Structure formats: C-alpha cells, structure tokens
Amino acid sequence: QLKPVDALQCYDCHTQIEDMHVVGKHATVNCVHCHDATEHVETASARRMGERPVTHTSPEACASCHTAQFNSFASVRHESHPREEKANPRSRSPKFDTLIGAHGFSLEHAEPRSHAFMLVDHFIVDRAYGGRFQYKSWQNVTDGLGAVRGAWTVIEDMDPTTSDQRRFLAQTATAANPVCLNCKTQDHILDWAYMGDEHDAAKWARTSKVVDFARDLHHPVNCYMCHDPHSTEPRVVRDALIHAVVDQGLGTYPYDEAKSEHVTLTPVTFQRGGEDFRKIGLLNVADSNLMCGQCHVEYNCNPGFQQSDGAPVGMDDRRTNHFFWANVFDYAEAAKEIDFFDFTHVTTGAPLPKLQHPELETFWGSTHERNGVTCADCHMPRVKLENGKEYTMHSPRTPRDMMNRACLNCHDGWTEAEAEYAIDYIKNYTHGKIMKAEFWLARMIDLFPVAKRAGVSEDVLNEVRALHYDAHLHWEWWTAENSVGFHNPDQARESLMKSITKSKEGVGKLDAAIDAAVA
Amino acid sequence: LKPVDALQCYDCHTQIEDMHVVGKHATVNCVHCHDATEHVETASARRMGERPVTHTSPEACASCHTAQFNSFASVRHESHPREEKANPRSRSPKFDTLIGAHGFSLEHAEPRSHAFMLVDHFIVDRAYGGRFQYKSWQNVTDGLGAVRGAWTVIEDMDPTTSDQRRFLAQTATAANPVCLNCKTQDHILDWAYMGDEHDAAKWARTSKVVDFARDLHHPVNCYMCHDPHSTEPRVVRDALIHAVVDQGLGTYPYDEAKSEHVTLTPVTFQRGGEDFRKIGLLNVADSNLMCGQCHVEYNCNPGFQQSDGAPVGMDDRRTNHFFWANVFDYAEAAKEIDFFDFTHVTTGAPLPKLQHPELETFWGSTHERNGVTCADCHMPRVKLENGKEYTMHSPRTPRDMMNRACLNCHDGWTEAEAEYAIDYIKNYTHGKIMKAEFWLARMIDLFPVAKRAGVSEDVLNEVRALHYDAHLHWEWWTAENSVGFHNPDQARESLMKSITKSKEGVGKLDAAIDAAV
Ligand code: HEC
Ligand code: HEC
Ligand code: HEC
Ligand code: HEC
Ligand code: HEC
Ligand code: HEC
Ligand code: HEC
Ligand code: HEC
C-alpha cells in the first residue's frame, strides 16, 4: 500500500519537473504512483543521480485512476485476422516473394493486429530474432491483457544462456535492431539517448546487442507516449519525429506552413551530468495525427547502403534512425538527400527502397486531412453513453466497428451500409491497381535473368534498374500503407498508375534487347 | 378506359372545371372516376338526365398511386385485434360497473388498423344485433379484402329483412346512419350536409340503418383528405365544418392566431339550385384537421335534454355534432345544446358518453404548441436510400418508426430513451385511471345501499350531480387512446378532479346511510 513522498524535497533538485507538475492536472498526484525513490533521495546530489530510482513504466501504473482508458487500451479485436501473411492470394501482396526477393520481409510479413500485442509480435515474428523468442503456448495468442502486463509473462527465450542473433528455426531472419523498439515500447525512455547515439548515460543505443536490449523491455505503446506524466499535456516522445519536425525545421505539417504554425511541438531537453541526454515534444493541442505519426510513418530503422558508392550504412550511422517525412512523390528526393537505399534486388541487381506503413504521409493533402480530421476521429473516438462520462477509447481500430461516431456524425445523410460501401468502392479500386502493378513488376523482374543469360548489355540492364527503383517505390508504398487507398484515393491512383507505367517501360526495353541479342 | 371529352363536361360543370384545370389532376381524365356516357346523351344544363356513376373505391386511385394505396391497405399485426376494454388486460377493468346498461357494455374493443374500420363497425356486438358477421374467422387478417369492399369479407345473416334486431343474445343495435360518416364516405353524393332530410339525398340521419349499411363498401376513402378534382387538401366531414364554420369556433378554437393561419374555406354544391353538400378546402395540408374528422368526441346517437329529460332523436341535428371543446369546457358545451347521453342504470344520474377525443386533448399540449401534427408522429414519410419518399397511408404507433417520429427532433435520445419517456407518461396516467375507476365504482356501488337504507332524494340528487363530473373526468381518458401522452398535464389535472369528485360522493353517501341507519 502506497505512502506519499514529500514532493517539495524532490522539487529542490527537480525544477523542470516542478514547473510541469505543479501547474497541470496531475498537481495532486504524488510521485510514489510512478517512482520508488527512497534510496535515490538518500544518495543523490545536485549533479549525481546516486542510487537510481525505480520508474514504473507499466500502463497499469495509470489504471489506479484511469481504469476505463486502461481497459480499452488492453482490449483485443478478434475480427482483426491474426498472424496473417501478406505474401498470399488472400491478403495484400500475392506476388510479394518475387517483388521483395531476398529482403528479410520475405521470411514473414503479417498484417497488423490489436495494439496490445505490438511488442510481443515484434519479438516473435519470423523475420526478427531468428525464432529465438516464442509464445510459451499457442493458447497465449488471445491474451491482450497479459501482453500489456509484460511480454515475458506470455513469451519465452529459447536460449537464455547466449546473447547473439542467430537462427533457431530454418526459415527465419535476424532483422531486428534496437531502433525498432522505439515504435513498440518506451520502457527504455530513460535508458536511450536522443536518436540512440552512444552516450555515457544510456544503457542502450543503436549499436547495442539487440537480444540483450529485448530482455529489458516489457510493455507495449506506453501511455506516456502521448501524455506527459507530470503535466498531463499532450506530447510526442519519439526521437526521429522531433528531429524531423523541430531540429530540421520541417514542421508538424511539412506540406502546409500555416497549419504548422497552428500545431506545434515545443522541445524539452533533459540532461545527465550537465550533458543533453533525451527530449520530448510538447503539443500545443491534442493533435492525434502527430501522436499516431510517432509510429505510423515510413522510416529507416535498419542498415542500408549509399546510393553514391554502394558503401554499407550500419547502425552506428544516424541514418539508421530516420523519418523521411515526405509524400510518395517526394520520397525518392528525400532518400537521395541522405544518400541512402535499403537493399539490392537479388534478381535484378537494382538498388531499391524498402517502404513501411506510411499512413501519416499518405493522409497529408487528402480531403479529410484538409478538413482538419485526425486519425483518432475515425479510429479512436469517444465512447457513447446514455448516462456516463464519455471517455476516449484507447485501442485504435477500423471505423467499421463504430460507424456512427467515426463517419455518420459528419456524413449525416448516409446510412451505415452506404458509408461502408463508399469505403469498399475505394479499397476495391485501389486493390485492383495494386494487383496490376504486381503483375507488371513481377513480369519485369522475371525477364531480368532471361536478359542476362541472352547477353543483354550492362547499359540496358542499368537503364531498367533505374526504372525498377521507381516501379518498386510506387507499388510498395500501397502494400505498405494499410488503408488500401482510403486515406488518399487520388494519390494512390496516380502513384500506382506511375508504377505500372514504369514497369511496362522496363518490360518493353528488356524484350527489345533480348530479341536483338538473340538475333 | 377510353377518355371522355372533358371540354364537353365543362360546358355544364363550371364549378368542377375551376377546380380541375388549375391543380395537379388537370391531365387526369374524368373516366378514371366517373361513367357518364348515358348522362351526356340525356342531360341538359338544367336536367341531369341519367345519373352518371361515380367510382368511390380507393382502388380507383391505385392506377396512378399504388405506393399510397398499398400502404393504406396494410395491416399492423401487433395491434391487438378484437381486444375488449372491460378487462384487467386492457384500458378499463371496471368498465361494466361504470357504464352500466349503455350499449358500449355489449362490446367495446381497442382500435386496430384503418383498413378494417368499416368492417369492424358493421360486425361489433353493440352495433347491429350481430346481423353482420365475417364469412369465416379466417377473414380477420384480410386488410386488402376489407379495402376492396366490406361485403367481400362479411355477410348479412338475413338479407330478407331490414329491421334492427338481435341475432345473438348479448348484442345491441346502437348503430345509426350518423356513425358511417366516420367509417366511409361512399355516400358523399347521397347525403345532405349534416344528414338533414333532403329531396336529393337517398340517405339521412333518419334512414333505416340496415338498408344504408348495405349500400356502403370502402373504408376511409382517399378523397376524405384530398379533393379528387384539384388534389388540394380538404375535409369532407359535415360535423367538423359545422363546428369550425357554423358554430364559429375556428380551426384551432384555443388559438385565434393559429385559426387565422390555418383556414377552412367551405364550398357548397347544389342540386336543382338548392344547397345540398359541403366540403372544406384547407390552405395547408394540416393533418390535425384531416385526422380530426374522426378522432374527436361527438354525438352520433339519440340522447336526452338536460332541461326536461325529453328524448332527442335522430331527426334532431344535435345527434350529429362535434363539441370541438377540451375536457374542461365539455360540460359547458353540452349544456349549450341542452344534451346528455344516458341515465346511469344504478345511480340514476344523467351522464355524458365520451369517445376518442384525440384532437381536443392534443390542443394546448407542448407538441401542438410547437406546430407538430398527428401525421408527424403517426403517419410520416417512408425512408429510402434511393427512392421518392412518399407519405405512409396507414397511421400507427410511433414505436414502429421512432427515428422519423421522434428522434429526428429529439436528436439527443436513443430509441430506448424516447420509448421510456412515452412509457413513463402512460404508466403514470394509467395508474390514475385505475384510481379513478376504484373511486367511481365505490361511489356507484353505494347507491343501492343508500336507496335501500332510505336516503333522501335530496342527498341522492347531490351525488348524481357529482357523478356527472366524476364520470366526465374519468371517461375522457379511457376514451382517449394515448393514455395521457397527447397531454400529460391535462390528463393529470382531469383525472385528479374525477377522483376528488368520487371521494366527495362516497363521503356523502356513507354519511347519509349511517344517519338513516
Ligand atoms: C491517481 C492517483 C492518478 C494517477 C495514478 C494517474 N492519473 Fe491521470 N489524472 C488524475 C486526475 C485526478 C486527473 C484530473 C482529472 C480532472 O479532470 O479533474 C488526471 C488527468 C489526466 C489526464 C488529463 C485529461 C484532461 O482532462 O486533460 C491525462 C491525459 C492523464 N491523467 C494521464 C495519465 C497517465 C498517462 C497516467 C499513467 C502514467 C496517469 N494519468 C496516472 C489522476 C491520476
Ligand atoms: C508506436 C508505439 C505506435 C503508436 C504511437 C500508434 N501505433 Fe497503431 N499500431 C502500431 C503497431 C506496432 C501495430 C501492429 C500491432 C501488432 O501486434 O500487429 C499497430 C496497429 C494499429 C491498427 C490495427 C489494429 C487492428 O485491429 O488490426 C490501427 C487501426 C492503428 N494501429 C491505428 C493507430 C492510431 C489511430 C494511432 C494514434 C491514436 C496509433 N495507431 C498509434 C504502432 C503504433
Ligand atoms: C480437453 C479434452 C480439451 C479439449 C476438448 C480442447 N483442449 Fe486445447 N488443450 C487442452 C490442454 C490440457 C492443453 C495444454 C494446456 C497446457 O497446459 O499447456 C491444450 C492446449 C491447447 C492449445 C495450445 C497448444 C500448444 O501450445 O501446443 C491450443 C491453441 C488449444 N488447446 C486450443 C483448443 C481448441 C480451439 C479446442 C476446440 C477445438 C481445444 N483446444 C479443445 C485441453 C483441451
Ligand atoms: C515506427 C516508425 C516503427 C518502426 C521503427 C518499426 N515498426 Fe514495426 N510496426 C510499425 C507500425 C505502425 C506497425 C503496424 C502497421 C503495419 O503495417 O504492420 C508495425 C507492425 C509490425 C509488426 C506486425 C506486422 C508484421 O509485419 O508482421 C511487426 C512484426 C513489426 N512491426 C516488427 C518490426 C521490426 C522487426 C522492426 C525493426 C526492423 C520494426 N518493426 C520497426 C511501426 C514501426
Ligand atoms: C497516443 C497513441 C495515446 C496513447 C499511447 C494513450 N493515449 Fe490517452 N488519449 C489519447 C488521445 C488522442 C485522447 C483524446 C484527447 C482529446 O482531447 O481528444 C486521450 C485522452 C486521454 C485521457 C483524457 C480523458 C479521455 O478523453 O478519455 C486520459 C485520462 C488518458 N487519455 C489516459 C491514457 C492512459 C491511461 C493511457 C495508457 C493506458 C493512454 N491515455 C495512452 C491518446 C493516447
Ligand atoms: C477517416 C476519415 C479516417 C482517418 C482520419 C484515418 N483513417 Fe485510417 N482508415 C480509414 C478507413 C475507412 C480504413 C479502412 C478500414 C476498413 O475496415 O476497411 C482505414 C484503415 C487504416 C488502417 C488499417 C486498419 C484495418 O484495416 O484494420 C490503419 C492502421 C490506419 N487506417 C491508420 C490510420 C492513421 C495512422 C491515421 C492518421 C495518420 C488514419 N488512419 C486516419 C479511415 C480513416
Ligand atoms: C349539360 C348538357 C351537361 C353535360 C355536357 C355534362 N353534365 Fe354532368 N350533370 C349535369 C346536370 C344538370 C347535373 C345535375 C346537377 C344538379 O342540379 O343536380 C349533372 C350531374 C353530374 C354529376 C353528379 C351526379 C350525382 O350523383 O349527383 C356528375 C359526377 C357528372 N354530372 C359528371 C359529368 C361528366 C363526367 C361529364 C362529361 C363526360 C358531364 N357530367 C357532362 C349536366 C351536364
Ligand atoms: C378521381 C381522381 C376523379 C376524377 C379524375 C374526376 N372526378 Fe368528379 N368526383 C370524384 C369524386 C370522388 C366525387 C364525389 C364528390 C367529392 O367531392 O369527393 C366527384 C364528384 C363530381 C361531381 C359532383 C359535384 C357535386 O355537385 O356534388 C361532378 C359534377 C364531377 N365530379 C365531375 C367531374 C368531371 C366533369 C371530371 C372530368 C373533368 C371529373 N369529375 C373527374 C372523383 C373524380
């Protein structure tokens, strides 16, 4: 049973926390709810931490006073198909194995499921840790509350005696590295320097042994990722987001200068031994586009290569923790700005980008974004109660489960069936274009070995490799992006038609050169 | 059908021309509703010649208005059919005590769907002595058949005679020609204004009702609310025109400004130059007036004079009368025409008989004050994602259509909330009706005890006067079908008045009995 501490004693040293805490809606909430600092208080100085206090990072620490939000946060949507592979005629990318080749995603790329599972799913997917981590039982796949309480309560390490990345099962990969975890958990928020730079005060960095880092982490999407625990104010904590918006001055809405003045991030920096260590970004308004955009964006969180000379770019380089902060039509220029590509296609030899869930950068410029709508309006609205305080739901999911709040409050002349039909019209149209982009891209790729074997020149092959970069970018954006065009149907349509145009041009060039060489 | 030359008709029918050429039926030929070949061959402008036929079936309109016709014939199976009200499961458990020997004691069922109204009027146990009966108990479901014609589904047990008499032991012969005006207007060209005897009218208040019944077929004819020549909104019910115009009360007798905004313009049709029949053209399609042609308290029956007790028979216009007054003005209105309905068989008190006063109850209520009308809650437009949204044509409880009937205005309520608010009012009102019955029955049951104990005529007469008001302020609410929802504060005040009167009467009888003993 908790005993409150003398907050004034803490404030004597912790003046920034004092300024945040005394002024906001947690002014009456005592430190003991989230910190055990008895030995710390006995041993600290103005400058030395002394004994490190415990910080309780479980979402359950908030549940004593916010049970409603915590229960919603831990909830599971069983209708979100679990562990469903995308390289599959029943899913998003039937030809993915041809198109992605030997990239790590070829070992497994499933569709997303409920937020409660995010850290568990990161740990156990076949592409991440060589199959090292596994659910303790296949019964455990249902346990959202268990996952929230801690990954290691439901999964286990197949070899606690070693820390190396290796394969435990034949068809797995070891693609995980420490940067990944920033979009799964912030349990390490006090143990990771801004951007993951090596730092005297950081136990973990981009260059850490990822198996050891994994074992130190527990909880998914911590509540304090979107709310400052001291002031309650809305914020973001994700380093690479703050870097793009603030350090690089690109703004919260990089395509809209006025909106970027209306929605702002105010950086706060915390130090260790008088040296800058970590940052947060305080929001002036609770804009969920920025909160959700901590994770639902295209990023680098992985080694790659330089476009200029092909040299490896490893985890020591800041480019391996980067938000591109660009729409699909600006992405190629943004990747050139950092002189970077992800992988060389195993079949075609083309340098290629690897794209991931660019929801926010797709949403920019869309009709709903232009009308001031945000992610949470459609995916995470308030509950509706005849006789209750209407809190915000806290496990985002498709608007199909909540159409009256998500759509019909604005679109008041539609029935639920009509609004869903409008969704399906866009998704069906967009999916059809994705299928055709895959047909043409796979056709181009399958012709590369024919061309090489027929003696087609390097000049022709290099021309088509350059087309492959763009054919790939303007296809993969849309298999990566989870709305199947709904977030921006006109952009999806223009981009996918560009992918097809490029692949058709590449097929034509290869067929002509093969026929000439023959022969 | 082959169209007639309407220009030829107009040469002798300027009154119809003026209505037909300007409205939305200008292109609709006379042949849809009239057979006039022999009429044209034989008429002059001053001589009818052969009487042309006028088609009065709602199905005459269905050639071009099938959507409205289909809705009009529809049946709500959830509206409990042939359910007696003198019943612990229905509106008036002590009705047999309270009404005594009145004709309604033979049978008084709850209403059901409009399609059955004429059929139900013909076959109820209190109307024709059981003379008319469904041909089979299977026929009770047949709304469409009833619309097409009562005599396709019911039959006369003795076509060879025309007298009112009992065919079954517990029946009554309460029907008379005035009843039919709220069931059908098939007789619209055969009935003079108010049912006065008239050379041009084959039927009148004084007609042999059994013969009149056999000439009638269809329920609530479409043209009761719509002029068939111009399409404009109208009423045709004589007693309503008489209340609004002849009695000078106006369309909304409790709101002078609203009576100026909603106007009834009477139009009279002549026969051989003598006034014969009337309609009332409305300036707006006001369903309060359209529905109030029938859903009102009325006389449509013989009675007695308050002054001297003399019978008032069907020859007297008072037997076709709309009081057009709220419950608190009703006693005054009935005194104005010197009329009461019956003498209670037990107490000997002159009493009024009240019937479904929905319009006069609705007046002054919150919804009426806000411009809502009957059809807004009971007969709204259909709801279609991709269609022309026509108006439904068989009125029913808003519980079947809550979004349209209530939640479009009350946008902060769920369906369950709105129904909850209905039920709160109906439950509360029903509880007061039960208490009013308890007390009125206790008072009535004490009359024989008082008489047998030798209580004086003076005391009995004081209590008979109280009976009039205790009865009025109870029966209004068993007669009115909303169980208070139409005007909850008025139901509350009125029922508490009934109870107060009955309690006073009980006290007076008990004191006199005790003294006499
Ligand atoms: C009880 C000891 C609490 C603990 C533990 C947590 N919170 Fe809290 N929170 C608490 C109170 C009394 C209030 C003010 C409520 C009011 O309006 O009177 C709050 C408020 C918040 C809010 C603010 C929402 C708003 O109205 O602006 C947020 C976003 C919030 N709390 C978040 C939060 C988090 C993430 C917690 C775990 C780290 C947490 N709270 C714990 C009381 C208590
Ligand atoms: C990083 C910590 C994240 C934040 C902040 C947000 N999301 Fe998220 N989301 C994230 C992951 C890693 C996943 C997949 C989890 C898994 O185990 O597979 C998701 C999933 C979703 C989904 C799909 C849910 C389903 O039913 O399948 C949706 C609809 C979604 N995310 C939306 C969303 C919103 C609206 C956010 C801001 C309120 C948000 N997410 C933040 C990672 C992270
Ligand atoms: C009793 C006769 C059972 C029947 C019927 C079903 N299950 Fe079962 N299951 C049972 C036991 C005793 C166990 C082991 C539990 C443990 O101590 O670990 C299980 C296990 C499972 C699992 C996990 C399998 C694994 O990890 O190897 C799953 C996914 C599972 N059970 C599901 C399941 C389903 C869907 C059933 C209906 C078809 C079913 N079980 C029936 C006992 C019994
Ligand atoms: C924020 C910019 C992220 C980074 C860094 C990583 N992931 Fe991620 N992940 C993110 C989101 C918003 C989602 C849900 C949307 C989606 O398209 O899946 C996910 C999902 C996953 C999943 C579940 C689905 C799947 O691909 O099987 C896994 C297993 C996963 N993420 C693993 C993973 C790895 C190994 C990472 C570093 C190489 C990594 N994630 C980083 C957001 C972000
Ligand atoms: C970003 C992806 C979030 C995470 C992680 C958590 N919350 Fe949240 N919260 C979020 C939004 C977009 C909102 C609505 C803000 C608005 O003004 O519209 C909220 C709101 C709250 C509140 C305020 C009361 C309410 O609206 O419900 C509280 C107390 C709150 N959130 C608590 C909370 C808890 C306990 C969390 C971990 C279980 C948590 N939030 C995570 C966005 C995000
Ligand atoms: C309403 C105008 C929306 C806005 C704002 C956001 N999203 Fe969305 N999203 C929307 C729809 C109609 C769909 C298709 C859902 C379906 O059931 O077909 C989606 C899809 C997603 C998904 C995948 C969810 C799933 O299929 O289960 C995700 C992960 C997602 N959207 C994320 C997301 C983000 C991060 C947003 C802010 C940048 C965002 N959405 C806004 C509708 C709307
Ligand atoms: C003058 C030569 C006429 C011609 C041409 C038409 N009609 Fe006539 N109609 C005429 C008279 C003198 C009367 C009687 C008026 C009176 O004082 O009673 C009528 C009556 C009718 C009626 C009403 C019959 C009833 O039941 O009372 C109808 C429905 C009618 N007429 C129709 C009609 C049609 C459709 C004609 C063109 C085909 C037509 N009439 C011509 C005189 C004359
Ligand atoms: C159905 C859509 C009709 C059309 C088309 C025509 N008439 Fe009509 N008429 C109709 C009805 C139901 C009645 C009964 C009276 C009522 O008001 O509902 C009538 C009546 C007449 C009369 C009698 C008027 C009177 O003096 O009482 C006449 C003279 C008459 N109708 C003539 C008439 C003509 C000439 C038409 C073609 C131009 C015509 N009607 C069309 C129904 C319908």
Ligand code: HEC
């Ligand atoms: C076709 C030969 C028709 C017959 C038979 C009946 N009606 Fe009619 N009606 C018809 C038309 C072409 C129109 C105009 C439609 C339009 O879109 O404008 C109408 C209109 C009406 C109206 C509505 C007038 C308005 O204000 O909108 C009513 C109330 C109406 N019609 C009633 C009606 C009745 C009661 C009929 C049988 C006596 C009848 N119509 C027959 C075409 C035809």
Ligand code: HEC
């Ligand atoms: C006389 C021609 C009437 C007109 C005009 C209106 N109504 Fe009526 N209604 C009438 C009768 C004789 C009956 C009982 C019929 C039977 O066979 O029992 C009714 C019944 C109703 C009901 C109850 C329907 C049910 O489902 O039980 C309602 C709700 C009703 N009536 C409403 C109503 C409305 C709103 C009207 C104007 C549009 C209207 N009625 C006119 C007689 C007559």
Ligand code: HEC
């Ligand atoms: C065949 C073996 C039947 C079974 C099973 C049911 N019914 Fe019947 N019913 C049947 C016939 C041949 C008739 C007479 C039809 C005629 O020519 O008139 C009936 C009659 C009725 C009636 C009317 C009764 C009467 O007027 O005396 C009703 C109300 C009725 N049937 C209803 C009914 C019900 C509800 C049934 C299931 C409980 C049922 N019948 C079964 C033939 C058969």
Ligand code: HEC
């Ligand atoms: C209009 C002023 C009417 C007069 C004249 C008659 N009735 Fe009626 N009736 C009218 C309405 C609005 C309703 C439905 C509402 C209700 O409270 O019932 C009815 C209903 C009936 C019924 C069915 C219910 C029942 O009492 O069993 C019957 C059998 C009936 N009416 C018969 C009837 C008789 C015999 C009449 C003359 C003595 C009579 N009605 C006149 C409206 C009007």
Ligand code: HEC
């Ligand atoms: C009074 C009780 C009515 C009876 C009898 C009939 N109708 Fe009607 N009708 C009535 C109302 C209150 C309305 C709505 C008028 C408004 O302005 O809101 C209507 C409307 C029509 C229309 C117009 C198109 C529509 O709204 O559906 C038509 C064509 C119509 N009515 C035809 C019609 C028919 C064919 C009838 C007998 C089957 C009928 N009406 C009777 C009120 C009344």
Ligand code: HEC
């Ligand atoms: C909405 C504000 C209404 C107005 C306008 C009218 N009525 Fe009504 N009525 C209303 C309710 C909520 C109820 C109770 C229905 C229930 O299911 O509990 C009623 C009831 C009736 C009835 C009895 C219907 C039945 O129980 O099946 C009748 C015959 C009726 N009302 C007639 C009527 C009249 C004639 C109106 C205009 C004068 C009128 N109602 C207006 C709600 C509303």
Ligand SMILES: [Ca+2]
């Ligand atoms: Ca990427």
Ligand SMILES: [Ca+2]
């Ligand atoms: Ca009466």
Ligand SMILES: [Cl-]
């Ligand atoms: Cl754990």
Ligand SMILES: [Cl-]
């Ligand atoms: Cl018939």
Ligand SMILES: [Co+2]
């Ligand atoms: Co699926």
Ligand SMILES: [Co+2]
């Ligand atoms: Co993905």
Ligand SMILES: [Co+2]
């Ligand atoms: Co019942």
Ligand SMILES: [Co+2]
């Ligand atoms: Co009744």
Ligand code: NA
């Ligand atoms: Na479920």
Ligand code: NA
């Ligand atoms: Na039914």
